[PDB]
Amino acid sequence: RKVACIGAWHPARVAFSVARAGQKGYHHRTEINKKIYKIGQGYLIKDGKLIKNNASTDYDLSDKSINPLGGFVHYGEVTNDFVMLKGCVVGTKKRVLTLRKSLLVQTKRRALEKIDLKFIDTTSKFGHGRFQTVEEKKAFMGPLKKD
Amino acid sequence: SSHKTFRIKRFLAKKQKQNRPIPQWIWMKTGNKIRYNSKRRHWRRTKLGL
Amino acid sequence: NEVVTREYTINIHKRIHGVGFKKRAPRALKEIRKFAMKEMGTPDVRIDTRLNKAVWAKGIRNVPYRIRVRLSRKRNEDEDSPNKLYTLVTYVPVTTFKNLQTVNVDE
Amino acid sequence: VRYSLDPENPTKSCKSRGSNLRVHFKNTRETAQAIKGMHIRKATKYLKDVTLKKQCVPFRRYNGGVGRCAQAKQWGWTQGRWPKKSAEFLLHMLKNAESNAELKGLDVDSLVIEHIQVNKAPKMRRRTYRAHGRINPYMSSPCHIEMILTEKE
Amino acid sequence: SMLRLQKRLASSVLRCGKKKVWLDPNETNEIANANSRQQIRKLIKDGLIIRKPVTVHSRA
RNA sequence: AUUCAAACGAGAACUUUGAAGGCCGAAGUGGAGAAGGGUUCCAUGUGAACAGCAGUUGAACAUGGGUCAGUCGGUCCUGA
RNA sequence: CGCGCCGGGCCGUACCCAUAUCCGCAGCAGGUCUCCAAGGUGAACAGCCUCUGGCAUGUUGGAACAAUGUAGGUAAGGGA
Known part of the structure; x- marks a missing residue:
């Protein structure tokens, strides 16, 4: 799991463009053109x-x-307002993110596309969930022993 | 070896009586330079020949 | 006031999670010892032999998930030490663990 | 005997010496440099914490390979260690030194270490066994320690 | 103290390995001054040292 | 592949006892011998050095102890 | 043939016999001739588990669980 040849001989130094082992992740990144599907409203x-x-x-x-x-x-x-962004964004869970307006004029039909959601999947992510709500779940399971 | 000869057994007897430290009172003698016994043989380090 | 005894349920499972096979039971005796030094703030913790036997009951790999123990803090007797108090952790055989709070037993 | 440094007022000072102490010289020189100027009661308390790893000894000179610790920031340094044996040796020498202040009739709670010196002692001889039937030396590096306390109000 | 003379002697008097010799842990100071197989046999009668039973290897 | 408690001790991850958990698994990590070693055997004591950490332990060190034959071998016989 | 009487000298004899008493410069994963040999599974002196007996993990511990290793594994679809 190494790089066989680092560099040639006569540039007697190893160059800065050769792959070396070191820190991976926890870098500062900025990826652009993440579309906002829904600006949710908090519990009130x-x-x-x-x-x-x-x-x-x-x-x-x-x-x-x-x-x-x-x-x-x-x-x-999530009991506050939220924003729903298409695709993945950088960082782990709880990681504070900065949302900046786009630096560029959005004049593509991809960027000018209107979004109307039809279904938001709220099944459990803590496993292979198969129910959207609890009301739906117990309506299917029926009564359990602990009753 | 448990099977010994009388020559060997008598030989090992001598090398056993020589392995003792010098008595304390000899370096109270006048012209005494001896500090300790320099011919102490340990059965695991020096192997006595034979 | 300071000589107190009380039952506890230690969740060994969540204090052993991750450690290797040949170290699960020995780590359990350390996490118990650390548990006592948190509740009864005494460095001297003496765990009973029958509690040791209860942790090694299933061997070294599989270690009981929960365990009921009686932490009793006593006055350190002779053998003078800075430790004026020591905690004796004792094993409590219990059938089930459901709805087992940390009751405050008395004497 | 002959000390490396003589106290300016021997009436207000006590000494203590140790010879051929089987403890690493490099570890002891570093722990001695940290204990140097501090008050004696502050010294014993510090040395006891080094044995408990609550305070480190900054390895200033002999630091090749010595790891980094978070407690070395108290000394404006990056590398530190907790030399247990080295601390407990000259924790005894402080005990012997303040015992001399009691005998000389000094106010012990005003003593301040001002001279502490660690010299190398004659090396001891052991051997290790290497590949291809070779034998390499396995020397120990003991040390001489001599310190001098003085009353300072 | 250290009791390895006694545990060896006890095993030889009981004709059993020192794996099966039980020295009473509460009464060490009385077994410490045994020093002799004659005094060991006295600790047999007084029940201070016991020959432990064989580990079970049920064939059922 | 160790763990708990106790005892001794200035001092215990390492000694000892007890308990627990394990391993060797009778082609053994068991019990005895030949060759070789030569006192390493055993007891008491010490902790300088040595036992590549430690040691209250040791095959280390210091004192003393210990090997009993008409029948077991040698001795006798011849072999290459 | 039965019984009775006398004599049998000299030398070896402790212990280790091997992941620490031997040889390899050493308490060295090497080397070094033999004897005895339980239960279960099974064709079996195989491997695996256990009793009698033995041991403390092989010249250290503790805390972490990064990269590279070393030794084990498993991998969708394809199949050299």
Whole structure:
């Protein structure tokens, strides 16, 4: 698991462009053109009852929030406003991210595309989850022994 | 060896009586330079020949 | 006030997780000893032999997940030391662990 | 005997010497340099922490290969270690030195180490066995330690 | 103290390996001054040292 | 592939005892011999040096002890 | 043939016999002739587990679990 030849002979130094072992990760990166699919709204209290149907769409209309079953693994539960970005973004869980407006004029039809979500998958990520909500889950399992 | 000859056994007897330290009172003698026995043989280091 | 005894349930499983086979049981006796020095703030911790036997009951690899113990903090007797108090950890045989709080036994 | 440095006022000072102490010279010179100027009660407390790894000894000169510790930042240094034996040897010499202050009739809680010297002693002879039937020396490097305390208000 | 003279002597009097010799841990100071097979046999009668039973190897 | 407690001790990861967990697994890490070693055997004591950490231990060191034959061998016989 | 009487000298004899008492400069993964040989599985003196007996992991521990190693493994689809 090495690099066989580092450099030639007569440039008697090893150059800076040769691959060497060292730190990997925890680098500062900036990747661009991450589209915002949905600016979610946090939990709020209203008339005594609270409102949490964040992951509700115009086609799902379910009372489920953005939180999957069992909360986000290694993070917790998102009770504030959130933003939904397409694809992966840099960093680990809980890692603070900086969201900067684009430096470039977006004049491609990819960048000008309108988004209307149809379904937000809130199954459990802490395993091979197979239920969107708890109301759906116990309606399928039926009653259990602990009842 | 457990099977010995009388020549050998008598020989090992001598090399055993010589392995003792010098008595304490000899370096109280007047013209005494001896500090300790320089011919102490240890059975594991020096192998006595034979 | 300071001479107290109380039951505890130590979750050995979450204090052994990761360590190798030939070290799981010995590490359990260290994590128990560290557990006592946290609750009863005494460096001198003496664990009972029957508790040792309870940890090595399943061999060196497989170590009981939970274990019930009685931490009793006593006055250090003669053999004068800076340690004026020591903690004697004792094993408590229990059938199940469900709904087992850290009760405060008394004498 | 003949000390490397003579106290300016011998009436206000006590000495202590050690010869052929089987303890690493390089480790002892470093722990002696850290103990040098401090008050005696501060010294014993420090040396006891070195044995417990609550305070390190900054390895200034003999530092090749010596690892980095977080406690060396208290000395404005990067490399430090916790030489247990080296600390407990000259923890006894402090015990012997302040014992001399008691005998000389000095105020022990005002003593300040001001001279502490570590010299090399004659090396001892052992041997190790290398490949291809060779024998290499296995010397120990003991040391002479002599310190001088003085009362300073 | 150190009791390896006694555990060897006890094994030889009991005609059993020192694997099976039990020296009472509470009464070390009385077994320490045995020094003799005659005094060892006295510790047999007093029950201070016991020949442990054979480890079970049930054939059931 | 070790762990707990105790004892001794100035001092214990290493000694000793007890308990536990393991290994050798009868072609043995067991019990005895030949050759070779030559006192290493055993007891008491010490901890300078030595036992590539340590040691309250040792095959180290210092004192003393220990090998009993008509029948077991040698001795006798001849072999190359 | 039965019984009775007398005599049998000299030398060896402890211990180790081997991952520490021998030879390899050493408490060296090497080398060095033999005897005795339990239960289960099984064709079996195989391998694996155990009892009798023995031992303390082989000249150190502790804490971590990076890269490179060393020794074990497993890999979608393809199959040299």
